[PDB]
Design a protein around this ligand. Structure first.
Ligand SMILES: *[C@@H]1O[C@H](CO)[C@@H](O)[C@H](O)[C@H]1NC(C)=O
Ligand SMILES: *[C@@H]1O[C@H](CO)[C@@H](O)[C@H](O)[C@H]1NC(C)=O
Lengths: 42, 50
């Protein structure tokens, strides 16, 4: 289950102070075992 | 169920399919075919005294 939110902030004070819910846009029937994750760069 | 279906101005998010009351009774549904938002109200009722 992946929840996403795009909030254009202006303060830039790292994580902002406030509330912003995230909506379940993606759900995948993957059925696998996940323990370690990494990110990808160009 | 049994009730009256009405066109509703409720703003469902695109992933939502239902809408419930305080007592966990459904008061809004989404049409599986035409993707319409239908409010469900109970039919007319009331106490009768003699
Ligand atoms: C997934 O793999 C780990 C080993 O790293 C194991 O302990 C676990 O039982 C497996 N299954 C899960 C997390 O559902
Ligand atoms: C099902 O009904 C909807 C509404 O009439 C229509 O848009 C859709 O194409 C239909 N699907 C199929 C597979 O016929």
């Amino acid at each position: 289950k992946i929840y996403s939110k795009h909030t254009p902030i202006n303060l830039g004070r790292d994580l902002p102070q406030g509330f912003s819910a995230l909506e379940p846009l993606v759900d995948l029937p993957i059925g696998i075992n996940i323990t370690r994750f990494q990110t990808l760069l160009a | 169920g049994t009730g009256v279906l009405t066109e509703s101005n409720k703003k469902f998010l695109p992933f939502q399919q239902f809408g419930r009351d305080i007592a966990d009774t459904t008061d809004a549904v989404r049409d599986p075919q035409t993707l319409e938002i239908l409010d469900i109200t109970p039919c007319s009722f009331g106490g009768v005294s003699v």
